[PDB]
């Protein structure tokens, strides 16, 4: 009975307070949807190998998730440890049902906690016995009592069956216990749903747990009615087991601050979107996510085919050394070092290691080493460091300003002593000959140069820098002789040659695996190197340290370190409300390795992803799984690349079909760009429209976003004194950036008023509305709303999150508090601000309305200058003249033009209202600032390598002097991140103001006059255009012409009448097939071919195209 751990195992990792935040992190987690070993009964061979024991001892394996159910209190406690005996320490963790008792005692092995053994009474056994499992308590170490973990007490309130889901962990010796209780109804299968597990007690027990079991106390059974021997264990408590693995997650809360749901950050390519995006709902499109890797484990990986220890003790058990001046160097090479037995034994007085941190010594492969043997005076040892100076340092031995291995110093009065003392060591005295690191000078400085202004010619007597060291064994301490060696490692100058005493193991290929080549501890898949290497080349960093290929130091063969098969992972999903399945794409990677792996591929189970027989597909964009190609091409919604798209809205597959799955199948195809049609080229004929279908489109444009700002400081500084002290010593940085905030913010308002204040004066609707049958109702404002806010823009407002997803009312705030007047944004907590527009919506609107009124009633003139009356009839007529249509057509066809107009308006509102997110760019900016702002928010929480992210604590619990560096590093980082944030807003400021200029143009040209530019203001011959604001934006109605209902017409540019080539003044000569007439290109107005509607010039004969006809002259 193995069963998916459907969603069970998730807990509370730490007790840091938080509310409704998608924080991703990683720990030892039982896999979800994962097999859990049921352990139920005594069923045959479940009791063999034991003493009729039902639920065997099990491997700990780094973590256990534990769960039991019952009708009534049955399941007793557990026992943990290495071996569960008195030989090795044990853990006895028992629920007395009166109290939970936890003991790390060394109790004798219990084959059964319930064995038929007892010695106080009649010899059989039973619960008559007083906890017979309590074998003996010798060398007990820990004892603890707490409240029971009662199992039925959960189920008592609701009269149901229950479970208790458990996670036992031992991290850093701390044995953390996380808990939960819940009712069930099904006992056959693991329930679907969700729950969280919270820490009960941490126990710093510090025993390597590897074996564990569950304990039960057998009373009896009633399966067969014979005797007390019918005390069958069959029908005893069952349970599940799984183990915990280091995989990443995501975790969520509710209003009450409690976990209600989670999305896994190590489960599924689909799930990884909801992880990385930090959403529980992913939208339609293509989304790229983070790659994966396998467990961190490996042996001593690959040290050279060299294996022989170095003779270190010679340096160390040596009785003949030199003085501090006579600092010798000794060569270490071509052997295996050890720094365990070196480090471990108790001989060294000084051991301190520089630029090198002393643990992994025995896994360090070195190129070469330098043993600096000499004897020092006891107090001088502190001066053995870079940054020291002194007679020994400045005049016996110096240090470079780069890495030197170690310092080893130790008293030598057991070998440097003669009862008469030791004058037998020496050092140089100062003589102003200051030198550089590592001069083995032994020159006798008896006479100087002489011309030096500090020596030679300066007042000397019998002085000799060679100063002997006079030891005495009866002299005391401080000046006792201290033999000292300077360890200095060269690394990376060559193949490393001397390694620590750690034998490496074999190597694997093509699997994502770490490794360590002579200290080169790297990772990836191992691909055979196709390079003719060069034999004095060990590792090839093809560019900028990228040690691309490696030659192993045991087999001497070359290996391209391909970083384990590397290629982007992106998803193809229709959304979340749509469905919960995904296509798996890898970027320019042929699916030849694992197609896709969460830590490994799998053949039959839920990871079923095959490069053949599964939903494999191959492109220049790399191989696809999930995606089955199909031949038919259509348009693209979720892109992939090269037109290859995985988006069919309506599939022929019924069951799943979501938008990218097709009955459990992601589909594959390419953008079809539209239909296919030859238009019949001829050299002599047109089709000129005999009707039209004008259209009005929706040109949607954001005009602004929030003029936020920040108290840079109180953002950062949170109003702290020493905070501000260190803050200022950086300085105007804050000032710089928020000055930018200023310029850009005021800038956007200038942009807005700019896109609005094009006119001197303000117009109102004329009360009578007899405007040629063109209804303006819905576009126009109505007094019923505050300040005559137009129907259309009201819909705009409602269609958008005026609240902007409520940045006054997301995860709420201080409720009803200083949060001021209920519509803008921005969740102000501290440091930050936003300032409401200089132009509130109301003016913004009534501008636009004045715009409208002018362009209707006075047309060209209201913004150009004085607004002058004109019938919008003949105004529209002149605008047809602007698109080149005579006022004849409008005159004749005024009513249907009106009707199309107003119907178009209605369709406009139909769209904008019905179509959600029609406004993309608007709410785009909204979202943009949303994240920018909110990120900025989160960035307070970045500890930045400090010991705490909050300024408060880092200042508080620290004395200032040390607090200086942490405070600083934080100042640096958060400051920096702000400055970044600033920069990004700047990015917008730019692209915004660009769009803003664009839109100001859009209005000015297409509205104060008539756009005559191609697709500037919408497809077609523009007539008029109209302003439709958004709280940070504007949309535009556009009156453009589209002809229709065409018919063939053979043509002739000239009419060859009366020996003279006659041509049409305005248009082209047209025929029905038999009658030659004149009409222009955008409509059939066949005309009697007159000299009035034509003209004569040149000759008719020389060039093709003409016909012969007659022409009528006035």
The CA distance from 547 to 574, in Å, is 41
Q: Residue 906 has which token pair?
A: 């209605």
DSSP letter string, 771-825:
STT---TTTS--TTSTT---HHHHHHHHHS-TTTTTTTSSS--STTSS--SSSS-
The CA distance from 566 to 524, in Å, is 9
Nearest to 1007 by CA among 841, 856, 876: 856
Q: Residue 661 has which token pair?
A: 């799955």
Are the C-beta atoms of 727 and 713 separated by less than 8 Å?
A: yes
DSSP strands (E only) in 965-1098? 1021-1030, 1033-1041, 1043-1052, 1055-1057, 1060-1063, 1068-1071, 1076-1079, 1087-1088, 1095-1096
Q: Residue 235 has which token pair?
A: 């029908």
Establish how many alpha carbons lie within 13 A of residue 871's alpha carbon, considering only the half-sphere containing its beta carbon. 10
The CA distance from 590 to 624, in Å, is 9
Backbone φ and ψ for 29, nearest 5 degrees, come out as -125, 130
DSSP letter string, 448-476:
--SSSTTTTSS---S--SEEEEEE-TTS-
CATH of residue 133:
2.60.120.960
Long-range contacts of 531-539 (CB under 8 A, 24+ apart): 531/558, 531/560, 533/558, 538/494, 538/495
DSSP strands (E only) in 378-415? 406-411
Backbone φ and ψ for 845, nearest 5 degrees, come out as -55, -60
B/e letters for 362-398, b = 16+ CB within 10 Å, e = fewer, are: bbbbbbbbbbbbbbbbbebbebbeeeeeebbbbbbbb
The CA distance from 880 to 1082, in Å, is 11
Are the C-beta atoms of 283 and 588 separated by less than 8 Å?
A: no
Pairing assessment for the beta strands 1033-1041 and 285-289 based on DSSP bridges: unpaired
In 3-state terms, what secondary structure has residue 311?
coil
Q: What is the DSSP letter of 4?
A: E
Are the C-beta atoms of 281 and 577 separated by less than 8 Å?
A: yes
Q: CA-based angle 362:518:551, to the nearest 5?
A: 165
Are the C-beta atoms of 913 and 795 separated by less than 8 Å?
A: yes
Q: Residue 473 has which token pair?
A: 């064994």
| Residue 71 burial by Cβ neighbours in a 10 Å radius (0-12, 13-18, 19+) | exposed
Pairing assessment for the beta strands 666-670 and 627-629 based on DSSP bridges: parallel
Q: Residue 1030 has which token pair?
A: 């958004």
Q: Please tell me the chain's helix, strand, coil percentages from 3-state DSSP, rounded to the nearest 5.
A: 20, 25, 55
Nearest to 441 by CA among 395, 482, 385: 395
The CA distance from 845 to 762, in Å, is 12
Q: Is the dihedral of CA 576, 579, 585, 591 positive or negative?
A: positive
Establish how many alpha carbons lie within 13 A of residue 814's alpha carbon, considering only the half-sphere containing its beta carbon. 8
Q: What is the DSSP letter of 1077?
A: E
Q: Residue 121 has which token pair?
A: 């009474």
Specify the DSSP element, H or E, that contains 987.
Answer: helix 960-1003
Instruction: Provide the terminal-to-terminal Cα distance of the chain, rounded to the nearest Å.
Output: 106
Residue with tokens 């053979």: 1050
The answer for 690, left when phi > 0, alpha when psi is -120 to 50, beta otherwise, is: alpha
The CA distance from 671 to 673, in Å, is 6
Are the C-beta atoms of 278 and 20 separated by less than 8 Å?
A: no
Are the C-beta atoms of 850 and 763 separated by less than 8 Å?
A: yes
Are the C-beta atoms of 103 and 91 separated by less than 8 Å?
A: yes
Are the C-beta atoms of 550 and 517 separated by less than 8 Å?
A: yes
The CA distance from 131 to 124, in Å, is 15
Are the C-beta atoms of 166 and 182 separated by less than 8 Å?
A: no
Name the residue range of residue 103's domain: 1-263
H-state helical runs in 236-395: 269-276, 312-316, 340-344, 391-395
In 3-state terms, what secondary structure has residue 1002?
helix
DSSP strands (E only) in 325-367? 328-332, 350-353
Longest dimension (CA), the chain: 146
Q: CA-based angle 309:311:316, to the nearest 5?
A: 135
The CA distance from 947 to 1071, in Å, is 90
In 3-state terms, what secondary structure has residue 1013?
coil
The CA distance from 31 to 19, in Å, is 25
Specify the DSSP element, H or E, that contains 901.
Answer: helix 894-914
The CA distance from 710 to 737, in Å, is 10
Q: What is the DSSP letter of 690?
A: E
Residue 572's alpha-carbon distances to 577, 582, 599, 665, in angstroms, are: 15, 6, 21, 12
Q: Which three-class secondary structure string do you get for 251-292?
A: ECCCCCCCCCCECCCCCCHHHHHHHHCCCCCCCCEEEEECCC
| Residues 6 or more apart whose Cβ sits within 8 Å of residue 447 | 456
The CA distance from 78 to 75, in Å, is 9
In 3-state terms, what secondary structure has residue 293?
coil
Strand partners, 199: 178
The answer for 1018, left when phi > 0, alpha when psi is -120 to 50, beta otherwise, is: left
| Residues 6 or more apart whose Cβ sits within 8 Å of residue 679 | none
In 3-state terms, what secondary structure has residue 434?
coil
DSSP strands (E only) in 694-801? 695-696, 699-702, 707-710
Establish how many alpha carbons lie within 13 A of residue 537's alpha carbon, considering only the half-sphere containing its beta carbon. 14
Q: Residue 1102 has which token pair?
A: 């020389």
């Amino acid at each position: 009975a193995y069963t998916n751990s459907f969603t069970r195992g998730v807990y509370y990792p730490d007790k840091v307070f938080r509310s409704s935040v998608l924080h991703s992190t990683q720990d030892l987690f039982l896999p979800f949807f994962s097999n859990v070993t049921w352990f139920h009964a005594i069923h045959v061979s479940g009791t063999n190998g034991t003493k009729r024991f039902d639920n065997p001892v099990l491997p700990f394996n780094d973590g256990v998730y534990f769960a039991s159910t019952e009708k009534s209190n049955i399941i007793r406690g557990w026992i943990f440890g290495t071996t569960l005996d008195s030989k090795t320490q044990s853990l006895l963790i028992v629920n007395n049902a009166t109290n939970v008792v936890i003991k790390v005692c060394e109790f004798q092995f219990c084959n059964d906690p319930f064995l038929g053994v007892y010695y106080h009474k009649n010899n059989k056994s039973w619960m008559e016995s007083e906890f017979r499992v309590y074998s003996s308590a010798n060398n007990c170490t820990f004892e603890y009592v707490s409240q029971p973990f009662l199992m039925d007490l959960e189920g008592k309130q609701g009269n149901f069956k229950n479970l208790r889901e458990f996670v036992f962990k031992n991290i850093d010796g701390y044995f953390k216990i996380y808990s939960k209780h819940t009712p069930i109804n099904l006992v056959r299968d693991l329930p679907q749903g969700f729950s969280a597990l919270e820490p009960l007690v941490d126990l710093p027990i510090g025993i390597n747990i590897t074996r564990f079991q569950t304990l039960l106390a057998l009373h009896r059974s009633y399966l067969t009615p014979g005797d007390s021997s019918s005390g069958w264990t069959a029908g005893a408590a069952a349970y599940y087991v799984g183990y915990l693995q280091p995989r990443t997650f995501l975790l969520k809360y509710n209003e009450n601050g409690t976990i209600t749901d989670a999305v896994d950050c190590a489960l599924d390519p689909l799930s990884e979107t909801k992880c990385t995006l930090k959403s529980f709902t992913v939208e339609k499109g293509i989304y790229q996510t983070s790659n994966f890797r396998v467990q961190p484990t490996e042996s001593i990986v690959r040290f050279p085919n060299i294996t022989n220890l170095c003779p270190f003790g010679e340096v160390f058990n040596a009785t003949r050394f030199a003085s501090v001046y006579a600092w010798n160097r000794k060569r270490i090479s071509n052997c295996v070092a050890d720094y365990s037995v070196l480090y471990n034994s108790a001989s060294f007085s000084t051991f301190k290691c520089y630029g090198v941190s002393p643990t992994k010594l025995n896994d360090l492969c070195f190129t070469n080493v330098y043993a600096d043997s000499f004897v020092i005076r006891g107090d001088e040892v502190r001066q053995i460091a870079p940054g020291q100076t002194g007679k020994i340092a400045d005049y016996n031995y110096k240090l470079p300003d780069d890495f030197t291995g170690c310092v080893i110093a130790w008293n030598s009065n057991n070998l440097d002593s003669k009862v008469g003392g030791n004058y037998n060591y020496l050092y140089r005295l100062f003589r102003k000959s200051n030198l550089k690191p590592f001069e083995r000078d032994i020159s006798t400085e008896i006479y100087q140069a002489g011309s030096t202004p500090c020596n030679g010619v300066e007042g000397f007597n019998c002085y000799f820098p060679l100063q002997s060291y006079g030891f005495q064994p009866t002299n005391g301490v401080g000046y006792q002789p201290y033999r000292v060696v300077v360890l200095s490692f060269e690394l990376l100058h060559a193949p490393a040659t001397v390694c620590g005493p750690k034998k490496s193991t074999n190597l694997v290929k093509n699997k994502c695996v770490n490794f360590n080549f002579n200290g080169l501890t790297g990772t990836g898949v191992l691909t055979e190197s196709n390079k003719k290497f060069l034999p004095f080349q060990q590792f090839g960093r093809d560019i900028a340290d990228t040690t691309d290929a490696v030659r192993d130091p045991q087999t001497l063969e070359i290996l391209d370190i391909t970083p384990c098969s590397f290629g982007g992972v992106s998803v193809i999903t229709p959304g979340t409300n749509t469905s919960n399945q995904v296509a798996v794409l890898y970027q320019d990677v042929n699916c030849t390795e694992v197609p896709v792996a969460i830590h490994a591929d799998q053949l039959t189970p839920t990871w079923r992803v095959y490069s053949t027989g599964s939903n494999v597909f191959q492109t220049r964009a790399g191989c696809l799984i999930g995606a089955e190609h199909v031949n038919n091409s259509y348009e693209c919604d979720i892109p992939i690349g090269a037109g290859i798209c995985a988006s069919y809205q309506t599939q022929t597959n019924s069951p799943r079909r979501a938008r990218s799955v097709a009955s459990q199948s992601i589909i594959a195809y390419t953008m079809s760009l539209g239909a296919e049609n030859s238009v019949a080229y001829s050299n002599n004929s047109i089709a000129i429209p005999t009707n039209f279908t004008i259209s009005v489109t929706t040109e949607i444009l954001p005009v602004s976003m929030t003029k936020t700002s920040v108290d840079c400081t109180m953002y950062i500084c949170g109003d702290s004194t020493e905070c501000s002290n260190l803050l200022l010593q950086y300085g105007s940085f804050c000032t710089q950036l928020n000055r930018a905030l200023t310029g850009i913010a005021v800038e956007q308002d200038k942009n807005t008023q700019e896109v609005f204040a094009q006119v001197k004066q303000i117009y109102k609707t004329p009360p009578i509305k007899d405007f040629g049958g063109f209804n303006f109702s819905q576009i126009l404002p109505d007094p019923s709303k505050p300040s005559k806010r137009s129907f259309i823009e009201d819909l705009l407002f409602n269609k958008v999150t005026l609240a902007d997803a409520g940045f006054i009312k997301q995860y709420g705030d201080c409720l009803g508090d200083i949060a001021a007047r209920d519509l803008i944004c921005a969740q102000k907590f501290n440091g930050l601000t936003v300032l409401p527009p200089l132009l509130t919506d109301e003016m913004i609107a009534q501008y636009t309305s004045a715009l409208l009124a002018g362009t209707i009633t006075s047309g060209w003139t209201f913004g150009a200058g004085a607004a002058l009356q004109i019938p919008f009839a003949m105004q529209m007529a002149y605008r047809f003249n602007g698109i080149g249509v005579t006022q004849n057509v409008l005159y004749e066809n005024q009513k249907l033009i009106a009707n199309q107009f107003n119907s178009a308006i209605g369709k406009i509102q139909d769209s904008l209202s019905s179509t959600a997110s029609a406004l993309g760019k608007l709410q785009d900016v909204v979202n943009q600032n949303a994240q920018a702002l909110n990120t900025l928010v989160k960035q307070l929480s970045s500890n930045f390598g400090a010991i705490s992210s909050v300024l408060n604590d880092i200042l508080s619990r620290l004395d200032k002097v040390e607090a200086e560096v942490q405070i600083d590093r934080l100042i640096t980082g958060r400051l920096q991140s702000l400055q970044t944030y600033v920069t990004q807003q700047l990015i917008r400021a730019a692209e915004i103001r660009a769009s803003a200029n664009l839109a100001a143009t859009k209005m000015s040209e297409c509205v104060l006059g008539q756009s005559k530019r191609v697709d500037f203001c919408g497809k077609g011959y523009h007539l008029m255009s109209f302003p439709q604001s958004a709280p940070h934006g504007v949309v535009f109605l556009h009156v453009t012409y589209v002809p229709a209902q065409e018919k063939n017409f053979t043509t002739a540019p000239a009419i060859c009448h009366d020996g003279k080539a006659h041509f049409p003044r305005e248009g082209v000569f047209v025929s029905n097939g038999t009658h030659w007439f004149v009409t222009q290109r955008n409509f059939y107005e066949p005309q009697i071919i007159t000299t009035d509607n034509t003209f004569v010039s040149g000759n008719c004969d020389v060039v093709i195209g003409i016909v012969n006809n007659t022409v009528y002259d006035p």
